[PDB]
């Protein structure tokens, strides 16, 4: 699970 | 950042916010015209915001500069997250000052147990969501290779490391991606991924910057 905002 | 503390305005002067009409990722200033971030943060329309503390208020000492180039590692793999690194060139050079400053690249990799500073404007909750106005900070150690592989079997490449905690409560989180892991004054990591945030036995995973120093230098030199 990547840690950007989506 | 979950379980961290308010850094203090401009105490992390290499930390940038990547903004597309909202904060979506962090990054690290490495010279007056170049930022390091994560490949999975790539998109069009990136504005780099330097000098920030409260990202929702114009306080003074901000510089907003559009990206002119956004260069993902050619071998970035969006499924495995191997080579999760991107370079952003700024349309114009940032004005460097006490609040806007570059961070040095490593000359060697860091050892397990090295303490580092991880920072960002990401979610501060391990369950649910709360996005902070001001920059948050976390002191965190690099974990051993064996601990990292035990936490994420089959998923850790030589271009990744784990940092943080196994007891829960302290981690980077959504909105921190692309931002810095700084150890002894060197940019050793990029916030990349993990299983949730601040969960027991599931530390954060970070791109291992020391493997990319020559690539960074060559890419900057040719652009
Ligand atoms: O802090 C710096 O590096 N320069 C002064 C400007 S006189 C300031 O911006 O406060
Ligand atoms: Ca601001």
Bridging pattern class, strands B5-6 and B34-37: unpaired
**Residue B79: partners with Cβ closer than 8 Å, 6 or more residues away:** none
Q: In chain A, what is the straight-line distance between the N-terminal and C-terminal CA atoms, in Å?
A: 11
Find residue B34's DSSP bridge partners.
B31, B89
The B136-141 sheet, strands edge to edge = B5-6, B136-141, B115-120, B180-183, B186-193, B204-208, B160-163
Task: Locate all alpha helices (DSSP H) within chain B, ordered by sequence.
Answer: 145-151, 213-221
Please check whether residues B119 and B171 belong to one and the same domain.
Answer: yes
Q: Return the CATH number at B90.
A: 2.40.10.10
Contact B193 A3 (CB under 8 A): yes
Neighbours of B58 (CB within 10 A): 9
Range of the domain at B190: 1-12+103-210
Structure tokens at B132: 């902070």
Return d(Cα B41, Cα B85) in angstroms, integer: 9
Quote the Cα angle for B208-B214-B48, to 5°. 70
CA B48 to chain centre: 14
Task: Round to whole Å and give the CA distance between B18 and B175.
Answer: 10
| Number of structural domains found in chain B | 2
Same domain assignment for residues B123 and B184? yes
- Distance from the A6 Cα atom to the nearest Cα atom in chain B, whole angstroms: 8
**Cβ separation A4–B174 shorter than 8 A:** yes
3-state secondary structure of B152: coil
Same domain, B52 and B161: no
Q: Count CA atoms within 13 Å of residue B182 on its CB side.
A: 23
- CA proximity to B35, closest of B75, B80, B68, B62: B68
Question: Please, are residues B176 and B193 in contact by the beta-carbon 8 Å criterion?
Answer: no
DSSP-assigned states of every residue in B168-180: SS-B--TT-TT-E
Contact between B13 and B98 under an 8 Å Cβ cutoff? The reply is yes
DSSP assigned state of B112: T
User: Torsions phi, psi of B148, nearest 5?
Assistant: -65, -45
**B141 and B176 assigned to the same domain:** yes
B5 and B30 together in one domain? no
Chain A residues within an 8 Å CB radius of B178 = 4
Q: Which of B22, B23, B175 sits opposite A3 (nearest CB)?
A: B175
Q: Are residues B195 and B150 in the same domain?
A: yes
Q: Could you tell me if B90 and B149 lie in one domain?
A: no
Q: Which residues of B touch A (CB under 8 A)?
A: 22-25, 38, 40-41, 81, 122, 172-178, 191-197, 204
Q: Which atom of ligand 1 is nearest to the CA of B61?
A: 9
Of B41, B196, B197, the CB nearest to A4: B41
Residue B23 falls in the annotated catalytic set: no
Q: Is B178 exposed, middle or buried (0-12, 13-18, 19+ CB in 10 A)?
A: buried
B107 and B206, same domain (yes or no): yes
**Alpha-carbon dihedral B102, B28, B217, A4, rounded to 10 degrees:** -170
B73 is catalytic: no
Residues B29 and B88 in one domain: yes
Q: Are residues B32 and B140 in the same domain?
A: no
Query: Residues B43, B141: one domain?
Result: no
SS (H, E, C) B44-76: CCCEEEECCCCCCCCCCCCEEEEEEEEEECCCC
Spatial distance between the Cα atoms of B100 and B185, rounded to a whole number of angstroms: 15
Kindly state if the Cβ of B108 falls inside 6 Å of ligand 1. no
For residues B203 and B193, what is the distance between their CA atoms, to the nearest angstrom? 9
Residue from B137, B122, B121, B220 nearest B182 by CA: B137
d(CA B209, CA B110): 10
**Technique of determination:** X-ray
DSSP state of B213: H
Gap between the Cα atoms of B15 and B31, Å rounded: 12
Q: Same domain, yes or no, for B5 and B108?
A: yes
- The neighbour count for residue B82, using CB atoms within 10 Å, is 19
């Amino acid at each position: 699970c990547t840690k950007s905002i989506c | 950042i979950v379980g961290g503390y308010t850094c203090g305005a401009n105490t992390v002067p290499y930390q940038v916010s990547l903004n597309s009409g909202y904060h979506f990722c962090g990054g690290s200033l490495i010279n007056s015209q170049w930022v390091v971030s994560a490949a999975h943060c790539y998109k069009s329309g990136i504005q780099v915001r330097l000098g920030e503390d409260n990202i929702n208020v114009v306080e003074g000492n901000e510089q907003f500069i559009s990206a002119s180039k956004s260069i993902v590692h050619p071998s970035y793999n969006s499924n495995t997250l191997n080579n999760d690194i991107m370079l952003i060139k700024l349309k114009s050079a940032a004005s460097l000052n006490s609040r806007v400053a570059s961070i040095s690249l490593p000359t060697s990799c860091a050892s397990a147990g090295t303490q580092c500073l991880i920072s960002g404007w990401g979610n501060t909750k391990s369950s649910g969501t709360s996005y902070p106005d001001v920059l948050k900070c976390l002191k965190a150690p690099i974990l051993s290779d064996s601990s990292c592989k035990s936490a994420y079997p089959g998923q850790i490449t030589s271009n990744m490391f784990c940092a943080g905690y196994l007891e829960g409560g302290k981690d980077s989180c959504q909105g921190d991606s692309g931002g810095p892991v700084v150890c002894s004054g060197k940019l050793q990591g990029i916030v990349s991924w993990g299983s949730g945030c601040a969960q027991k036995n599931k530390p954060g995973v970070y791109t291992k910057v020391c493997n990319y120093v020559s690539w960074i230098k060559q890419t900057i030199a040719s652009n």
